[PDB]
Amino acid sequence: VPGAIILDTVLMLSGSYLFTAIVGAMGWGLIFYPGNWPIIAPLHVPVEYNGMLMSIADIQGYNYVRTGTPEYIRMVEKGTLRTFGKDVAPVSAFFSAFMSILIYFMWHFIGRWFSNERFLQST
Amino acid sequence: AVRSHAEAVQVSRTIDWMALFVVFFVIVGSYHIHAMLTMGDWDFWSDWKDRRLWVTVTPIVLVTFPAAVQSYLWERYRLPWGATVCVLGLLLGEWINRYFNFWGWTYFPINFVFPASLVPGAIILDTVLMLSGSYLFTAIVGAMGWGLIFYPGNWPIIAPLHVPVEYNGMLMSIADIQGYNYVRTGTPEYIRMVEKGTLRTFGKDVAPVSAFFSAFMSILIYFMWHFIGRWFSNERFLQST
Amino acid sequence: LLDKKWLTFALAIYTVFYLWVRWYEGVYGWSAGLDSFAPEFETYWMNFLYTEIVLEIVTASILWGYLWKTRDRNLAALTPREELRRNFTHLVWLVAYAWAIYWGASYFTEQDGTWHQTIVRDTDFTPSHIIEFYLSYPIYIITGFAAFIYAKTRLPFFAKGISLPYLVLVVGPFMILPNVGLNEWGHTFWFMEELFVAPLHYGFVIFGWLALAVMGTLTQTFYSFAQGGLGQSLCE
Amino acid sequence: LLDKKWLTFALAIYTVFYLWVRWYEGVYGWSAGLDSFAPEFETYWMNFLYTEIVLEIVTASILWGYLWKTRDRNLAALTPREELRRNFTHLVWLVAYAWAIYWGASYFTEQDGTWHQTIVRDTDFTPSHIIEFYLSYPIYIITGFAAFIYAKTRLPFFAKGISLPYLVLVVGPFMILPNVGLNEWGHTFWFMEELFVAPLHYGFVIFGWLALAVMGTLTQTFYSFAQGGLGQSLCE
Amino acid sequence: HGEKSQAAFMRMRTIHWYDLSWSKEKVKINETVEIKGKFHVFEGWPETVDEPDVAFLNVGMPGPVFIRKESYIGGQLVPRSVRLEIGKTYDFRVVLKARRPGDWHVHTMMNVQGGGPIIGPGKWITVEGSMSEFRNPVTTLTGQTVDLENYNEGNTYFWHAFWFAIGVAWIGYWSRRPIFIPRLLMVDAGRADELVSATDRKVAMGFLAATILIVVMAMSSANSKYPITIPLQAGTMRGMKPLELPAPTVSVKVEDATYRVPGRAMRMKLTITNHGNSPIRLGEFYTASVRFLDSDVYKDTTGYPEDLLAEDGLSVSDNSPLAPGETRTVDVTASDAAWEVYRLSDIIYDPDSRFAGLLFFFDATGNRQVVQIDAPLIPSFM
Amino acid sequence: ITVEGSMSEFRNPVTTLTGQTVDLENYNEGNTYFWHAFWFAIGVAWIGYWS
Amino acid sequence: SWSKEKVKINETVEIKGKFHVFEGWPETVDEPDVAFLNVGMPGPVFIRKESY
Ligand SMILES: CCCCCCCCCCCC(=O)OC[C@H](COP(=O)(O)OCC[N+](C)(C)C)OC(=O)CCCCCCCCCCC
Ligand SMILES: CCCCCCCCCCCC(=O)OC[C@H](COP(=O)(O)OCC[N+](C)(C)C)OC(=O)CCCCCCCCCCC
Ligand SMILES: CCCCCCCCCCCC(=O)OC[C@H](COP(=O)(O)OCC[N+](C)(C)C)OC(=O)CCCCCCCCCCC
Ligand SMILES: CCCCCCCCCCCC(=O)OC[C@H](COP(=O)(O)OCC[N+](C)(C)C)OC(=O)CCCCCCCCCCC
Ligand SMILES: CCCCCCCCCCCC(=O)OC[C@H](COP(=O)(O)OCC[N+](C)(C)C)OC(=O)CCCCCCCCCCC
Ligand SMILES: CCCCCCCCCCCC(=O)OC[C@H](COP(=O)(O)OCC[N+](C)(C)C)OC(=O)CCCCCCCCCCC
Ligand SMILES: CCCCCCCCCCCC(=O)OC[C@H](COP(=O)(O)OCC[N+](C)(C)C)OC(=O)CCCCCCCCCCC
Ligand SMILES: CCCCCCCCCCCC(=O)OC[C@H](COP(=O)(O)OCC[N+](C)(C)C)OC(=O)CCCCCCCCCCC
Ligand SMILES: CCCCCCCCCC(=O)OC[C@H](COP(=O)(O)OCC[N+](C)(C)C)OC(=O)CCCCCCCCC
Ligand SMILES: CCCCCCCCCC(=O)OC[C@H](COP(=O)(O)OCC[N+](C)(C)C)OC(=O)CCCCCCCCC
Ligand SMILES: CCCCCCCCCC(=O)OC[C@H](COP(=O)(O)OCC[N+](C)(C)C)OC(=O)CCCCCCCCC
Ligand SMILES: CCCCCCCCCC(=O)OC[C@H](COP(=O)(O)OCC[N+](C)(C)C)OC(=O)CCCCCCCCC
Ligand SMILES: CCCCCC(=O)OC[C@H](COP(=O)(O)OCC[N+](C)(C)C)OC(=O)CCCCC
Ligand SMILES: CCCCCC(=O)OC[C@H](COP(=O)(O)OCC[N+](C)(C)C)OC(=O)CCCCC
Ligand SMILES: CCCCCC(=O)OC[C@H](COP(=O)(O)OCC[N+](C)(C)C)OC(=O)CCCCC
Ligand SMILES: CCCCCC(=O)OC[C@H](COP(=O)(O)OCC[N+](C)(C)C)OC(=O)CCCCC
Ligand SMILES: CCCCCCCCCC
Ligand SMILES: CCCCCCCCCC
Ligand SMILES: [Cl-]
Ligand SMILES: [Cl-]
Ligand SMILES: [Cu+2]
Ligand SMILES: [Cu+2]
Ligand SMILES: [Cu+2]
Ligand SMILES: [Cu+2]
Ligand SMILES: [Cu+2]
């Protein structure tokens, strides 16, 4: 919701589609994780689970068995050798904020084409 | 208003110098960013200047800017030096960074971090354009020349760095020893995208085949970037962003 | 009078400021600049980021604001002679933008083509970035916008409708800064090496192509230059 | 009279039928629905496919046929008042199409976002498919075409030339069904897991984008609505 | 310098460096410093990194302050990338020649094809003298001795300046006439065909012919001089001889490991079984470039870096000599300011709270045994 | 395998390192619902305002 | 070893021997995880009856 609101406000407020694509897209990308933090926060409490350190969400996934969804399919942060300090969430957020600019720019014209009102007279 | 014809000429001259400066430095900045992020790695290191990968990819990714700038300058002013000015700007920026940064900030030798020569290709691209106005001809022929003359144009420079040396029981070239010596902490030996030899490498055809492959690819890149430069040369107005 | 000595200053400030910038990073590369967790790094490189980020935002607001405030309301009643002067001033602005473009998109960026090729990425805010991404890029982005705003508020014919080429030549290059998120996300995540030709980089390449709209901008500026005082001389 | 109570029924049938569909699959998921080679699976899920495939083909022929048979031959001689009524009926048809779209492209498809996440694909004709691919998709495809045919045969201005947006909003979403061949071929072949974001799936995504032509369809319908009885009121 | 920022768990479980030794601490210009030691590839390789199928033995330093004279994995020179086997132990030797005066932090790192740089311990080495005194002589197979500091420099400059000159001349030639506005108007207002007329075409043909002829003649001249050339030598080197270490006689089982958040200490409970026939004792615990030592058992004499060395950072609840065959469980606490200085307590932020390290057990006679421990590392807050 | 009883009797207790014992069957459920309902409400208000 | 040097039509010739995979496998080639024992000849002049 927060991202949608920002995207709309920055559009009404500041009519230019260019501004909205650059700013509202920045806001949409950046506010995603902070907007969901109140919800997933409680599921990130560390737990001592049979000698291994697991979060509440990890224990939930371990417990409630997903027969078609094995643990390895989980595309999640695993940590690399080029992960300096605590910048996983901000960098990813910023990367998503930038990508969303381009996606908004392309889908503006996509929606323009979908909003065309032409007639054919023969399919 | 202007005043007289004399002032007009002078004012026109002044504008020329200023416009040239704007075009030259904007191209240098953009071209450099494009060139260094698509072929920079090979243009950084003599032990990277190989016969397959460097000769293949450098002309292909380096004809982009010259094609667009030619498609604009020739069409709008009959000025046949778009490719030459692009190449000279890229060389100037690269040399500036090679001397003040690579040999300035850090202490990497110039004979190790020298850039590649691209003047001959630029010249051919411009001449074959002025000579033979058709953009189609230039894209097919001048691109052939640009791709083919790259390695022979740089051979006088990298030749001396290819002398075999007995280095601690192993055979290494001068460029290989330079790369082995001057340590690049962020650039390990395995990252070097260079000719390693396959099972389908018949005789001595690595340099010519790669050169010919680059000559062909450059045709397509020039053809696409001609229209890219046309679009960038559009003069429309919006009235609302 | 026409073209004054404002162009001299334009080329001077950038050169002078950028000359000292190289001297700074040149004196603070190794030692209290290498280790990103040292206490001396927060005093010589962390402070730089902060300081430069505030000044950039402040200057931008002032520059752009002042330029948009003194915008000519009566463009219709503008003498050809005066228009010519304004065209020369806009050409000086374009020269300053070209100089800043070169410094930010060529020097400091290739100045970086070196730092990495010598040291291991300690953090997302290394010395070269505290110079390239967050100083030179905002500086040219500021100059770019300024030039665009000036042309749309002063000179006649460049207003009454945003120029496509001009907008693309001012926003195209301005998109590189945000793409910094990309290559960072590239480094931090996909790619554990130092290859300069990796994809998490074509982002600068894609928006570096948009700087080729300078050709349309310059022909549009020529047409504007050849409005009243286009002759004669020209075709005469 | 104008907009009647046909819209109420339109929303009712889909809801009611789809409500029982969930009840069926809800009572026949596990046991004679899990094992695809059991004799009870051919009596509770195999029969469903067959039965639903015949009824869909039959109803389509009848619905589309009847709609095309009673097509207005004298559209020229149509009173504005009557036209308005027909426009409201077409809007009811569009509401029914939107309801069916949601049920087939949102519920049963995400209802599936669950079955797989719980059980291993036994065959290409699992319970959820006997509901999603071969029942809800044909139902909305039928409604879609019906709405399109009705607009081109009744209301004036929507005829005499196939509406691009309308055609794209009726065929775009209709292409998802056949793409079922793709993801199946995806599953059966390339991809041994259960990832929902795999490529052998972007096929639904590509043709799910074509449902955005509903905007052009709705503005075209608005223009048609504002033909004779567009005012006034509107801009007055 | 580049570490402390990488994930603590991955730094702990990748490559363990031990037996490190530096020949000199202060060197003159052109003097040689040799770095030796052993590195062990951890069996529990992090799944996020590719296996060291293609690895390069690099050196961590700020630019080319030291030139890598020689580098060896085992006993054979390795100028190219090499293949390392997970679980194997190799001995390395790097020879560096001083080039730039100053104080530098030299690290013995390893670069994996797709897993980032694995930086090892770094030692401060002081270089005295002047950079102008540095020489890098090298004899070629053609029978000529050339310096690598300025070889081909002159030739490189000449050719580049020569071409840049040609390009400037070309642009300059057309730059003599008015450039932008009159030509644009001429091209616009009516047909062009006046801005480009002979002898302009003749000049362009001369330029093209001269460029082609110069390129061909320069290639021919560079083929006569230096008639013997070889392509760039590259390729991953296989068959890396690993160390033939004897099977450890001491078995260690890690039964839970905890560290305080916040804190500078790591605590673990170990059940040590002493096989063979000799009283052993735990004297060291190496986790990630940090050596926790028990001063009552072992003392460091190899000049290990002070910031990475804990002289009495290893505390054992019962460090009495362990009789052969006897098995006992003890509590081991590794506490040093280096566990926070090198962000070793930042493993809680990592998505994999597991550690790996080496335990060094020494007997009365002085001979030591190397055993490896790996277990989940559980943070403690209350 | 046959299971007898009622689903309402199922308990999934788990003790965290923070010193608190929570059930995994309904932990954070209330909080999850609140936040989602709160945002959905905001969105409806926005659209409602213009609606 | 080759069983015969000159053969008639429909006659059989058997080629035997040993091959050793070099430990220092060139990094440019993939490891023989998937290998096929083929025969080098100009077209189908000899039909591969059996291969072991
Ligand atoms: C009023 C205006 C002035 C405000 C200026 C803001 C100051 C900057 C604060 C830095 C945050 C910090 O402190 O560090 C960064 C923290 C790391 O956290 P760490 O692990 O503790 O690093 C400690 C290391 N130090 C001590 C040296 C900091 O996250 C990040 O890497 C964020 C990475 C984001 C990169 C993508 C940015 C793209 C920008 C796009 C342009 C639109
Ligand atoms: C119009 C735009 C509105 C944007 C509103 C942003 C709200 C601020 C959120 C604070 C972030 C934080 O607190 O730190 C970063 C955390 C990540 O933390 P973590 O790795 O999960 O650590 C877990 C432990 N926690 C719970 C303490 C975190 O969240 C993020 O990654 C989102 C980063 C986006 C912030 C970018 C803002 C920079 C200004 C934008 C400039 C152009
Ligand atoms: C006046 C016009 C007549 C001139 C005609 C030219 C004669 C051809 C000379 C052959 C060179 C040679 O001699 O061999 C080729 C040398 C190999 O060298 P090698 O290892 O010694 O091979 C010895 C084997 N032999 C003894 C049988 C030769 O390099 C090459 O494979 C070049 C490969 C280029 C392939 C791509 C070509 C694409 C063409 C694009 C079309 C525009
Ligand atoms: C207008 C277009 C102008 C083109 C000018 C070309 C100059 C000729 C260079 C000689 C090449 C050579 O001598 O042999 C090939 C060498 C490669 O040698 P190497 O593998 O490095 O061996 C190292 C030992 N050396 C030093 C003896 C070489 O160079 C090249 O790979 C470039 C091959 C491109 C030549 C294509 C020309 C064919 C005619 C074009 C037809 C449409
Ligand atoms: C268009 C928008 C442009 C705005 C961007 C401006 C960014 C400012 C840079 C922040 C500096 C910093 O990083 O910190 C500020 C540093 C902190 O360094 P220190 O360790 O105290 O060393 C002592 C500082 N000396 C070593 C430089 C003496 O001290 C300073 O104040 C002095 C820096 C002044 C630089 C101005 C000289 C330029 C020459 C004339 C051209 C105007
Ligand atoms: C609407 C269209 C928008 C789509 C764009 C969304 C971003 C895609 C995110 C990929 C995540 C994923 O899919 O998976 C993540 C995979 C998993 O690989 P791994 O096993 O961790 O490999 C380990 C190797 N490391 C350790 C180096 C990670 O990492 C990748 O290979 C990342 C592939 C790059 C994709 C991003 C390209 C962006 C293009 C930028 C050019 C301008
Ligand atoms: C626009 C084109 C739409 C056409 C699509 C229609 C597909 C029909 C579905 C096939 C059913 C099947 O799968 O089989 C038919 C099943 C076989 O199941 P059974 O094991 O005998 O259980 C006994 C059947 N009970 C368990 C349902 C009783 O029995 C039936 O006949 C009864 C199904 C009637 C469903 C109609 C109720 C809808 C509520 C009112 C809304 C009209
Ligand atoms: C004119 C343009 C039309 C071209 C389209 C033709 C279809 C291509 C068929 C590929 C067969 C092939 O080329 O090879 C088949 C390869 C061989 O891999 P394997 O060794 O069996 O891997 C084993 C892994 N399994 C066990 C999972 C298979 O399987 C593949 O990787 C399939 C790659 C997917 C290609 C299809 C993408 C379709 C795009 C749909 C988006 C709308
Ligand atoms: C050079 C780039 C710097 C950023 C400027 C980009 C904005 C350009 C948008 C544009 O084209 O103009 C649309 C409106 C026009 O409304 P106006 O009638 O000009 O209103 C002026 C009074 N106002 C300051 C309260 C706005 O004006 C606006 O869009 C709003 C102007 C106020 C700026 C803050 C709005 C954005 C809020 C996030
Ligand atoms: C997945 C990609 C999205 C699909 C969007 C592509 C639409 C392409 C536009 C198009 O279909 O052109 C129609 C022409 C036939 O023209 P006519 O029938 O003569 O119509 C006259 C007016 N018109 C020429 C402007 C159309 O060309 C034809 O031959 C008729 C073909 C019409 C097919 C369009 C239906 C698309 C549904 C998926
Ligand atoms: C069928 C394809 C075979 C190749 C021909 C492609 C060239 C077509 C280019 C074209 O469209 O014409 C542009 C000019 C027109 O100039 P003209 O006024 O026709 O000059 C004729 C006298 N001339 C022979 C010296 C040129 O004429 C020229 O471009 C130059 C013509 C001379 C050929 C050699 C020029 C290229 C040098 C590398
Ligand atoms: C990376 C790809 C390169 C970017 C090049 C894409 C440019 C696309 C052309 C474009 O922007 O169209 C503008 C129209 C708005 O039209 P209007 O503002 O009504 O202008 C009237 C004249 N015109 C319709 C021909 C423009 O559409 C709009 O809604 C306004 C959006 C303008 C954004 C263009 C700025 C691009 C900067 C990156
Ligand atoms: C067109 C771009 C010019 C870039 C020149 C540059 O980076 O200069 C820095 C470099 C630094 O080397 P050096 O001159 O020896 O002075 C060293 C001072 N630090 C280390 C602070 C750079 O050399 C100069 O200062 C020469 C002045 C050129 C004026 C256009
Ligand atoms: C316009 C050409 C883009 C080609 C992309 C490319 O070269 O990617 C190489 C990379 C292969 O990875 P690799 O080079 O092996 O990376 C080695 C280093 N790690 C494993 C850390 C990433 O492939 C991908 O991961 C997908 C790229 C998607 C592009 C839109
Ligand atoms: C807008 C879509 C509404 C979808 C509601 C749905 O799937 O309902 C089935 C579910 C089934 O759960 P329950 O009500 O407990 O009844 C179980 C009966 N079966 C197992 C057959 C579904 O709950 C209801 O039937 C509530 C009625 C809502 C009317 C809009
Ligand atoms: C618009 C983005 C499309 C990117 C495609 C993609 O993610 O493919 C992943 C897959 C890599 O396979 P992987 O994820 O390792 O699959 C693991 C499961 N198996 C081995 C059974 C397929 O690559 C391919 O096989 C080529 C895809 C062609 C797209 C037109
Ligand atoms: C990738 C986005 C392209 C959208 C196509 C829009 C075409 C509009 C033509 C009227
Ligand atoms: C891939 C090259 C496409 C270039 C686009 C040019 C469009 C011109 C329209 C006027
Ligand atoms: Cl970069
Ligand atoms: Cl699906
Ligand atoms: Cu950098
Ligand atoms: Cu399914
Ligand atoms: Cu260091
Ligand atoms: Cu180990
Ligand atoms: Cu062998």
mmCIF file of all heavy atoms in Angstrom, chain A residues 48 51 53 79-81 83-86 88, chain E residues 5-6 10 48 115 346 349 353 376 378:
data_model
loop_
_atom_site.group_PDB
_atom_site.id
_atom_site.type_symbol
_atom_site.label_atom_id
_atom_site.label_comp_id
_atom_site.label_asym_id
_atom_site.label_seq_id
_atom_site.Cartn_x
_atom_site.Cartn_y
_atom_site.Cartn_z
ATOM 1 N N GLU A 48 17.084 -21.062 19.402
ATOM 2 C CA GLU A 48 17.948 -22.234 19.499
ATOM 3 C C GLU A 48 17.102 -23.467 19.198
ATOM 4 O O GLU A 48 16.321 -23.917 20.041
ATOM 5 C CB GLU A 48 18.576 -22.325 20.887
ATOM 6 C CG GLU A 48 20.049 -22.685 20.877
ATOM 7 C CD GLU A 48 20.309 -24.042 20.261
ATOM 8 O OE1 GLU A 48 19.631 -25.017 20.648
ATOM 9 O OE2 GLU A 48 21.198 -24.133 19.388
ATOM 10 N N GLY A 51 20.189 -27.279 18.502
ATOM 11 C CA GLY A 51 21.600 -26.993 18.324
ATOM 12 C C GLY A 51 21.922 -26.048 17.183
ATOM 13 O O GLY A 51 23.043 -25.555 17.082
ATOM 14 N N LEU A 53 20.988 -22.499 14.902
ATOM 15 C CA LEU A 53 20.355 -21.192 15.003
ATOM 16 C C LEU A 53 19.380 -21.000 13.850
ATOM 17 O O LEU A 53 19.767 -21.042 12.685
ATOM 18 C CB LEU A 53 21.401 -20.081 14.991
ATOM 19 C CG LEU A 53 20.836 -18.661 15.003
ATOM 20 C CD1 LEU A 53 20.253 -18.332 16.367
ATOM 21 C CD2 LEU A 53 21.897 -17.650 14.608
ATOM 22 N N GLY A 79 24.697 -14.903 1.454
ATOM 23 C CA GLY A 79 25.957 -14.266 1.786
ATOM 24 C C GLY A 79 27.096 -14.629 0.849
ATOM 25 O O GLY A 79 27.362 -15.802 0.589
ATOM 26 N N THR A 80 27.775 -13.613 0.341
ATOM 27 C CA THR A 80 28.898 -13.826 -0.559
ATOM 28 C C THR A 80 30.168 -13.306 0.094
ATOM 29 O O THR A 80 30.163 -12.926 1.264
ATOM 30 C CB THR A 80 28.692 -13.101 -1.899
ATOM 31 O OG1 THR A 80 28.799 -11.687 -1.700
ATOM 32 C CG2 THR A 80 27.322 -13.424 -2.472
ATOM 33 N N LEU A 81 31.258 -13.288 -0.665
ATOM 34 C CA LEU A 81 32.529 -12.799 -0.152
ATOM 35 C C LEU A 81 32.667 -11.300 -0.399
ATOM 36 O O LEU A 81 33.611 -10.667 0.074
ATOM 37 C CB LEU A 81 33.694 -13.549 -0.796
ATOM 38 C CG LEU A 81 34.029 -14.910 -0.183
ATOM 39 C CD1 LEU A 81 35.011 -15.668 -1.063
ATOM 40 C CD2 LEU A 81 34.582 -14.745 1.222
ATOM 41 N N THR A 83 30.182 -9.047 0.458
ATOM 42 C CA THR A 83 29.085 -8.451 1.210
ATOM 43 C C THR A 83 29.661 -7.686 2.392
ATOM 44 O O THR A 83 29.823 -8.234 3.481
ATOM 45 C CB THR A 83 28.107 -9.518 1.726
ATOM 46 O OG1 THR A 83 27.346 -10.046 0.633
ATOM 47 C CG2 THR A 83 27.156 -8.916 2.749
ATOM 48 N N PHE A 84 29.970 -6.415 2.169
ATOM 49 C CA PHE A 84 30.557 -5.560 3.196
ATOM 50 C C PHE A 84 29.531 -5.064 4.211
ATOM 51 O O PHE A 84 28.503 -4.501 3.844
ATOM 52 C CB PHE A 84 31.265 -4.380 2.536
ATOM 53 C CG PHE A 84 31.612 -4.620 1.095
ATOM 54 C CD1 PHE A 84 30.986 -3.907 0.088
ATOM 55 C CD2 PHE A 84 32.557 -5.571 0.748
ATOM 56 C CE1 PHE A 84 31.302 -4.133 -1.238
ATOM 57 C CE2 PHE A 84 32.879 -5.800 -0.575
ATOM 58 C CZ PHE A 84 32.249 -5.080 -1.571
ATOM 59 N N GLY A 85 29.854 -5.271 5.484
ATOM 60 C CA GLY A 85 29.033 -4.848 6.602
ATOM 61 C C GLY A 85 27.547 -5.111 6.506
ATOM 62 O O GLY A 85 27.105 -6.155 6.020
ATOM 63 N N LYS A 86 26.770 -4.150 6.993
ATOM 64 C CA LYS A 86 25.321 -4.257 6.978
ATOM 65 C C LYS A 86 24.718 -3.373 5.896
ATOM 66 O O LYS A 86 24.291 -2.251 6.166
ATOM 67 C CB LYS A 86 24.750 -3.893 8.348
ATOM 68 C CG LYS A 86 25.421 -4.612 9.505
ATOM 69 C CD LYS A 86 25.312 -3.812 10.794
ATOM 70 C CE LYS A 86 24.953 -4.705 11.970
ATOM 71 N NZ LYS A 86 25.680 -6.004 11.926
ATOM 72 N N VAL A 88 22.929 -5.177 3.058
ATOM 73 C CA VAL A 88 22.132 -6.062 2.210
ATOM 74 C C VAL A 88 20.757 -5.461 1.947
ATOM 75 O O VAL A 88 20.330 -5.315 0.795
ATOM 76 C CB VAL A 88 22.019 -7.459 2.843
ATOM 77 C CG1 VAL A 88 21.253 -8.396 1.922
ATOM 78 C CG2 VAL A 88 23.393 -8.012 3.156
ATOM 79 N N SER E 5 35.150 -6.702 6.435
ATOM 80 C CA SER E 5 33.884 -6.408 5.785
ATOM 81 C C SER E 5 33.180 -7.641 5.253
ATOM 82 O O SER E 5 31.950 -7.644 5.172
ATOM 83 C CB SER E 5 34.091 -5.423 4.625
ATOM 84 O OG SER E 5 33.878 -4.087 5.046
ATOM 85 N N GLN E 6 33.920 -8.685 4.894
ATOM 86 C CA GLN E 6 33.311 -9.921 4.441
ATOM 87 C C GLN E 6 32.601 -10.615 5.600
ATOM 88 O O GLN E 6 32.853 -10.335 6.776
ATOM 89 C CB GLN E 6 34.364 -10.848 3.836
ATOM 90 C CG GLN E 6 35.561 -10.117 3.251
ATOM 91 C CD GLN E 6 36.620 -11.064 2.724
ATOM 92 O OE1 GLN E 6 37.591 -11.372 3.413
ATOM 93 N NE2 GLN E 6 36.437 -11.530 1.494
ATOM 94 N N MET E 10 31.861 -16.867 6.572
ATOM 95 C CA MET E 10 32.576 -17.278 5.370
ATOM 96 C C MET E 10 34.076 -17.079 5.526
ATOM 97 O O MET E 10 34.866 -17.885 5.023
ATOM 98 C CB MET E 10 32.043 -16.524 4.155
ATOM 99 C CG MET E 10 31.239 -17.410 3.218
ATOM 100 S SD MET E 10 30.614 -16.525 1.786
ATOM 101 C CE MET E 10 29.758 -15.197 2.620
ATOM 102 N N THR E 48 27.627 -20.840 -1.177
ATOM 103 C CA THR E 48 27.517 -19.597 -1.939
ATOM 104 C C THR E 48 28.726 -19.336 -2.838
ATOM 105 O O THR E 48 28.638 -18.579 -3.803
ATOM 106 C CB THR E 48 27.269 -18.386 -1.014
ATOM 107 O OG1 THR E 48 26.094 -17.690 -1.447
ATOM 108 C CG2 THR E 48 28.453 -17.433 -1.032
ATOM 109 N N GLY E 115 33.890 -16.815 -6.006
ATOM 110 C CA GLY E 115 33.650 -16.815 -4.576
ATOM 111 C C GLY E 115 34.286 -15.663 -3.823
ATOM 112 O O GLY E 115 34.354 -15.685 -2.594
ATOM 113 N N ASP E 346 30.242 -10.187 14.442
ATOM 114 C CA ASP E 346 29.250 -9.724 13.486
ATOM 115 C C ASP E 346 28.758 -10.901 12.650
ATOM 116 O O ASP E 346 28.355 -10.737 11.499
ATOM 117 C CB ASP E 346 29.841 -8.645 12.580
ATOM 118 C CG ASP E 346 29.468 -7.245 13.026
ATOM 119 O OD1 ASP E 346 29.724 -6.906 14.199
ATOM 120 O OD2 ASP E 346 28.919 -6.486 12.202
ATOM 121 N N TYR E 349 24.720 -11.158 12.139
ATOM 122 C CA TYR E 349 24.134 -10.501 10.988
ATOM 123 C C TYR E 349 24.236 -11.409 9.767
ATOM 124 O O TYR E 349 23.581 -11.168 8.756
ATOM 125 C CB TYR E 349 24.852 -9.179 10.717
ATOM 126 C CG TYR E 349 24.312 -8.415 9.533
ATOM 127 C CD1 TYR E 349 23.292 -7.487 9.689
ATOM 128 C CD2 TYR E 349 24.824 -8.618 8.260
ATOM 129 C CE1 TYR E 349 22.796 -6.785 8.608
ATOM 130 C CE2 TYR E 349 24.333 -7.920 7.174
ATOM 131 C CZ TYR E 349 23.320 -7.006 7.354
ATOM 132 O OH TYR E 349 22.828 -6.309 6.275
ATOM 133 N N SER E 353 24.989 -18.938 10.792
ATOM 134 C CA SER E 353 25.718 -18.819 12.056
ATOM 135 C C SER E 353 26.456 -20.126 12.352
ATOM 136 O O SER E 353 26.105 -20.901 13.243
ATOM 137 C CB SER E 353 24.766 -18.446 13.184
ATOM 138 O OG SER E 353 25.428 -17.669 14.169
ATOM 139 N N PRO E 376 27.683 -25.236 14.678
ATOM 140 C CA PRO E 376 26.869 -24.016 14.716
ATOM 141 C C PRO E 376 27.276 -23.124 15.878
ATOM 142 O O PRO E 376 27.634 -23.600 16.957
ATOM 143 C CB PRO E 376 25.439 -24.545 14.883
ATOM 144 C CG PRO E 376 25.489 -25.955 14.407
ATOM 145 C CD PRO E 376 26.858 -26.456 14.744
ATOM 146 N N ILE E 378 25.926 -20.245 18.310
ATOM 147 C CA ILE E 378 24.643 -19.759 18.805
ATOM 148 C C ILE E 378 24.882 -18.476 19.595
ATOM 149 O O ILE E 378 25.574 -18.517 20.623
ATOM 150 C CB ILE E 378 23.943 -20.811 19.679
ATOM 151 C CG1 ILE E 378 23.820 -22.135 18.920
ATOM 152 C CG2 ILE E 378 22.580 -20.307 20.120
ATOM 153 C CD1 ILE E 378 22.998 -22.040 17.657
#
